[PDB]
Ligand binder design. Sequence first.
Ligand SMILES: COc1cc2c(NC3CCN(C(C)C)CC3)nc(C3CCCCC3)nc2cc1OCCCN1CCCC1
Ligand SMILES: COc1cc2c(NC3CCN(C(C)C)CC3)nc(C3CCCCC3)nc2cc1OCCCN1CCCC1
Ligand SMILES: Nc1ncnc2c1ncn2[C@@H]1O[C@H](CSCC[C@H](N)C(=O)O)[C@@H](O)[C@H]1O
Ligand SMILES: Nc1ncnc2c1ncn2[C@@H]1O[C@H](CSCC[C@H](N)C(=O)O)[C@@H](O)[C@H]1O
Ligand SMILES: [Zn+2]
Ligand SMILES: [Zn+2]
Ligand SMILES: [Zn+2]
Ligand SMILES: [Zn+2]
Ligand SMILES: [Zn+2]
Ligand SMILES: [Zn+2]
Ligand SMILES: [Zn+2]
Ligand SMILES: [Zn+2]
Lengths: 268, 270
Amino acid sequence: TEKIICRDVARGYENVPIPCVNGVDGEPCPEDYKYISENCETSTMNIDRNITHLQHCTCVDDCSSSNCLCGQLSIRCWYDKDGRLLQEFNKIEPPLIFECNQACSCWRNCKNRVVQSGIKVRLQLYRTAKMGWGVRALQTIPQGTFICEYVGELISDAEADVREDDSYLFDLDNKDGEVYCIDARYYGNISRFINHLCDPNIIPVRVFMLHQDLRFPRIAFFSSRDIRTGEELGFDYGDRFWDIKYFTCQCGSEKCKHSAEAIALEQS
Amino acid sequence: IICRDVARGYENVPIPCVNGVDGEPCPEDYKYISENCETSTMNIDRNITHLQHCTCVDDCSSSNCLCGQLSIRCWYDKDGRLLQEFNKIEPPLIFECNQACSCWRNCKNRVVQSGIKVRLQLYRTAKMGWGVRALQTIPQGTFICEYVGELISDAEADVREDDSYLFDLDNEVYCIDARYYGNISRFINHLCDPNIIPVRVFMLHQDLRFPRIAFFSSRDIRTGEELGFDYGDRFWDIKSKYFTCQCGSEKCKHSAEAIALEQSRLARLD
Ligand SMILES: COc1cc2c(NC3CCN(C(C)C)CC3)nc(C3CCCCC3)nc2cc1OCCCN1CCCC1
Ligand SMILES: COc1cc2c(NC3CCN(C(C)C)CC3)nc(C3CCCCC3)nc2cc1OCCCN1CCCC1
Ligand SMILES: Nc1ncnc2c1ncn2[C@@H]1O[C@H](CSCC[C@H](N)C(=O)O)[C@@H](O)[C@H]1O
Ligand SMILES: Nc1ncnc2c1ncn2[C@@H]1O[C@H](CSCC[C@H](N)C(=O)O)[C@@H](O)[C@H]1O
Ligand SMILES: [Zn+2]
Ligand SMILES: [Zn+2]
Ligand SMILES: [Zn+2]
Ligand SMILES: [Zn+2]
Ligand SMILES: [Zn+2]
Ligand SMILES: [Zn+2]
Ligand SMILES: [Zn+2]
Ligand SMILES: [Zn+2]
């Protein structure tokens, strides 16, 4: 039978509790990491936090106009009235989102402040059948809804290359510059338990909020379609992960590109 | 009511602005910010491994909370008010719980980080310009607001024309300048009979160069009563050559009447 291992893995740091359940085996709630709601540093990253370096808008409205400088920096503001990404949003090659900040003239509740307002959907940490821990939806989630942020430890490329466990690295590669990582192995949030799906229902987006240091985008997961209740969330880890990894994909999708069956067909 | 919220929704509560004295509109010669900002490379030590934290599995109400111990004892009661025994003359540093603690976000040692809870008003006074008054009764030791401004160096503070909004952070001295960037606390006037006290607090970082200033009530504050702290003699030694105190207290130490009595006491002596 299924039991509640923990009422809130986030210890009240989120807008909503993120409980933990297991109805598959006798493995307890994971405790081999530190839950953090916001990205942390373990060495000086010299993030540019200078308020005068912030590009901002002069909006006296709710930032719903074509004239919002912040919306313009993002090509257009991609959020609708309810905070969901527009259907026209490029899901394959997504643009950078520049949310409003503390230097804008607008209010804290303007239409360009979705990711900075945190988690709004009901999520659950649960034990899967062949992928260990996973994250599923406790409610129906419409397409373009913000889910959560890929929160971890901000580390350099030189540091990522010295780490034994690389199963929690998110790459932050820019146009023509530096390489920085988010490692969610020692420090991370709920997104560290999101598994790979060959048919994914969430997409990662590079977002800027309180700072605009281009070497440090924050990763926001948005639904890439309508998600049913109980449905497991997942994004494509990329071919680099499957080229690196010892274990085959257990997503079980009919359109699975990284199963042992699919791998053996490609080699043949 | 001239403005519904001077904080543009950045606070837990709206901070409205009123004027029933003159024709001056609500102030717009500054940028409202809910949190301290930087205008130069400050590099506040934000390394999570450098954080002193507790191992509390409870709500941090015990004598065993390391964070409470760093603060001598946790000075907050069940309701988040400072204990009566709290040294109001020479206050200790408060080390609130942080993201490295094992406790929950709603533990008993997280008062200042949970922001403004009292209903405040920005209003026009009779002889002190803009001031901040209470729209509710406030019990002693209640957290009011933070002295939010721009984080600047001593060398920078010495190069600034307007020094009427500087808060000193001495331990290498740093300042909070609330002239260009600031919050509601930038309108808190000086009172010779003060009802609020400043306290140095540490929360998400423990870079001792940058304590955050928290204002707590020093006594029970009636509704409508203007909030104010003692700016210190250093301010009145600077600013007396230009203006005198208008707090109107019977125990006023910086009124033109008090200044003229001291100069007459010295001329009678030597
Ligand atoms: C297979 O998993 C990844 C391995 C990665 C990896 N491997 C290095 C190889 C050298 N190795 C040394 C001990 C010899 C250290 C580890 N390196 C890097 C950056 C790349 C730029 C240069 C610095 C390092 N990123 C990775 C990202 C990976 O995940 C990809 C995204 C999907 N993740 C899954 C969970 C969250 C999102
Ligand atoms: C009169 O107000 C103050 C003036 C100050 C002041 N003045 C300097 C003098 C030199 N001057 C140069 C043109 C030569 C530049 C300005 N300097 C400093 C520090 C001292 C240590 C080294 C850096 C500078 N602190 C001050 C604090 C003050 O307020 C005290 C508290 C009350 N405030 C009221 C609002 C909120 C709290
Ligand atoms: N589609 C998939 N097939 C098999 N294993 C998967 C998978 N997706 C994720 N995993 C597992 O999850 C790791 C990435 S982090 C995901 C959280 C993890 N399942 C946990 O229990 O902590 C992968 O390295 C692998 O161990
Ligand atoms: N007790 C007092 N007597 C006379 N002026 C005062 C005062 N307390 C504060 N002030 C005024 O307030 C300044 C500090 S900032 C306080 C906010 C200010 N009253 C405003 O309208 O913006 C002082 O330099 C002085 O201009
Ligand atoms: Zn705008
Ligand atoms: Zn806006
Ligand atoms: Zn904006
Ligand atoms: Zn698969
Ligand atoms: Zn504790
Ligand atoms: Zn605590
Ligand atoms: Zn603590
Ligand atoms: Zn006075």
